[PDB]
Design a protein that fits this description.
The complex is a heterotetramer, with two copies of chain A and two copies of chain B.
Chain A: no helix or strand
Chain B: E1 4-6, H1 7-17, E2 23-27, E3 40-41, E4 51-52, E5 56-59, E6 66-73, E7 88-92, E8 104-107, E9 115-118, E10 128-129, E11 140-142, H2 150-159, E12 163-167, E13 172-177, E14 181-182, E15 193-194, H3 197-207, E16 212-218, H4 222-235, E17 238-242, H5 252-260, E18 264-267, E19 269-271, E20 279-285, E21 288-295, H6 299-317, E22 327-332, E23 336-337, E24 343-350, E25 359-362, E26 373-377, E27 386-387, E28 392-397
Parallel strand pairs in B: 1-19, 6-7, 13-16, 13-17, 14-15, 17-21, 22-25
Antiparallel strand pairs in B: 2-12, 3-11, 4-10, 5-7, 5-8, 6-9, 18-20, 20-21, 22-28, 23-27, 24-25, 24-26, 26-28
Helix pairs in contact in B: 1-6, 3-6
PDB class: biosynthetic protein,structural protein
Keywords: Scaffolding protein, Neurotransmitter receptor anchoring, Molybdenum co factor biosynthesis, structural protein, biosynthetic protein
Assembly: tetrameric
Chain lengths: 9, 401, 414, 11
């Protein structure tokens, strides 16, 4: 879980 | 003034510093959304008697298919008085008890009335819920920490446990600060606008079903802030304020929190967009810890920050074991350049026909539909200067899907 | 008795036969979940005055970078009384209006103080680094909302932002569709209240609490008619009471030969109309749906099965969608999402529906749907999130295996 | 929109 937006590789 | 805090840190800080409320005893019918502070044990078997699944006939499985005498019917509310001898059956309805002598049930479709031909091929136990099939006496039906919904309430009803110990709900007080704010009901005056955040915040926390307290508009000055905060503090577990200035010395709020209330301010700025100017503080009064949020006046910031920080905190106060929001993957509907700050957009989630991922449509746009999630954009990096339509992104769910 | 209806048909029939309720005038603060029956027009600009984006200084863009006199600060909630001549600036904060004469705003961080009075230490002078394009860091009048424009359209299903919008534009009274009042009863001579101790052959009434809680979750008002005896007299009384007090009457349990006192009372005594009485589904085959036209108003009536799993499943497949239509939502159909099957399962010939829990695991695109099956037993700290919509048995699908993409209906706010 | 659930092969 993370509350900063993430990119999907 | 106050250091820029990383979004990761602001959020972690909010959860750690947020206390869990204590417990209280409620009626099962008020359990919606409450977390159980106890295990719940079943004190009877369900069903208490062997019960038919089908509307049909209770039969002996040694008697195979054949012609049978109907001795009577098993009534729904009653203990069966007759017993089934070979060559006999009793009419049964769904949920009725099985009489002694029968070991199986056959539907009407596989067949007062005197005689029945029974087409059968039935195995022992067939279409019967034995005693304790669904619930066994004495077993833990609901565990401590369980976050209840309508089924859970039904379960309490089923096992007779009509009073139950649950965590308390946070009472949440909301105010708006600013010299430019008028109530929604007022006509505009020179240099002034209507207070929109108070309604938006109260409605948001209402959606989650916690009780709220409207302290109204408060003037941007030490006297008027100290009064409202004190009133908020004596009446509520959480005090939320929107608006107010934070340039130099006119930060009367941060000044009142520190000097007058001797609160403790864990952060006053966070490296995010929107909502950089957000403040979080705790105040330990008589051993009780109250928590205080000062969100930015910008209406978009208010609702975004409320969802990123406040709701999770309220979820923890309410006793939820993971108060963090559900983040789901979705496909970006519209191109966008990245800000150096992690950014958050109110977006609408739609699951289109046969497509595995939902599409997240940023509002930045007159949808018939209320904003469903927060599009969590990442921060700018050299390998991600922009994002294109179709790319998989994280969306935080913020209301009903 | 009554023909088997296809699940597709039962659902379509329920929506067509379900009426939209009329409208009423409410206070904006009660708008949560309500659908607007009107367009809403804005009667002022937002902002009404040009407003600074940044905390900083309002400047002339012709002056360019240089040393400037600070004439004053623009106060929040006042009309600015001074005006900016060349070689001047006024301090601004973020909410604040721009004074006449300025066409741009510069942040504090693109400046550096030169002089202060130090007779109370107000600022006198500022070096303004940077040149600002005209319009820079200002919300002109009507930037966000233009006067007279439609801010919210008819049919809009409101949430907290929408309420904030009504607050913003001053529209504190608004016409919305009504909410269905929903009455719930349990029928069965085997039922005792939850509060009672068990007696021979009897069980506690669980469906009443479950249904009322479910409808409550969506925020519609409800009416508890309690347990009702399985017989014409007692049914006709409760139904009549339900009918005079509510738009929807829901009943759980009761038997279905000639002991179907409910279907018998609906037809003979109330002259209701029964659109279906059995549906080819699992659970919930014995479900009944009827309408009754009384004084032009159409009330709607559901008789769900006694089985507790059936009750909650059917409530979600049929009732909630109908309630959503009554409340004025333009597509009342539920959200169906793709998910990955967590546990193997054999298929029934009937389309089947399992209460399941949805989990989105970190950095996996699809959520996993974990079936509960089952009244207890399977214990998760977490309330059932969706209905796993299993397909019907076919020769090429006798069973389903872990990992396969399946349809899950979302039930309840996560 | 489908009220009865589906699967479909991908081989």
């Amino acid at each position: 879980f993370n509350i900063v937006g993430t990119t999907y590789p | 003034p106050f250091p820029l805090t990383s979004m990761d840190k602001a959020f972690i800080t909010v959860l750690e510093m947020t206390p869990v409320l204590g417990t209280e005893i409620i009626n099962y019918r008020d359990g919606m959304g409450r977390v159980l502070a106890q295990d719940v044990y079943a004190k009877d078997n369900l069903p208490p008697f062997p019960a038919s699944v089908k509307d049909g006939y209770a039969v002996r499985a040694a008697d195979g298919p054949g012609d049978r005498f109907i001795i009577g019917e098993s009534q729904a509310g009653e203990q069966p008085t007759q017993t089934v001898m070979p060559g006999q059956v009793m009419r049964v309805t769904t949920g009725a008890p099985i009489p002694c002598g029968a070991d199986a049930v056959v539907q009407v479709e596989d067949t007062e009335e005197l005689e029945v031909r029974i087409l059968v091929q039935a195995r022992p136990g067939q279409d019967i819920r034995p005693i304790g099939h669904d619930i066994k006496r004495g077993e833990c039906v609901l565990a401590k920490g369980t976050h209840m919904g309508p089924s859970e309430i039904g379960l309490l009803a089923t096992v007779g446990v009509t009073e139950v110990e649950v965590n308390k709900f946070p009472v949440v007080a909301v105010m708006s600060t600013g010299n430019e704010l008028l109530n929604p009901e007022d006509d505009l005056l020179p240099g002034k606008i209507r207070d929109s955040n108070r309604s938006t915040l109260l409605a948001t926390i209402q959606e989650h079903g916690y009780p709220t307290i409207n302290l109204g508009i408060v003037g941007d000055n030490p006297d008027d802030l100290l009064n409202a905060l004190n009133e908020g503090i004596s009446r509520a577990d959480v005090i939320i304020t929107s608006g107010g200035v934070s340039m130099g010395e006119k930060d009367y709020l941060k000044q009142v929190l520190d000097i007058d209330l001797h609160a403790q301010i864990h952060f006053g700025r966070v490296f995010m967009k929107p909502g950089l100017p957000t403040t979080f503080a705790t105040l330990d009064i008589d051993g009780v810890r109250k928590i205080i949020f000062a969100l930015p006046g910008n209406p978009v910031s208010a609702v975004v920050t409320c969802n990123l920080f406040v709701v999770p905190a309220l979820r923890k106060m309410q006793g939820i074991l993971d108060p963090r929001p559900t983040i789901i993957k979705a496909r970006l509907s519209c191109d966008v350049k990245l800000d150096p700050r992690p950014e958050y957009h109110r977006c609408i989630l739609t699951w289109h026909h046969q497509e595995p991922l939902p599409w997240a449509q940023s509002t930045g746009l007159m949808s018939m539909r209320s904003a469903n999630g927060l599009l969590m954009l990442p921060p700018k990096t050299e390998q991600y200067v922009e994002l294109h339509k179709g790319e998989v992104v994280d969306v935080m769910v913020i209301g009903r899907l």
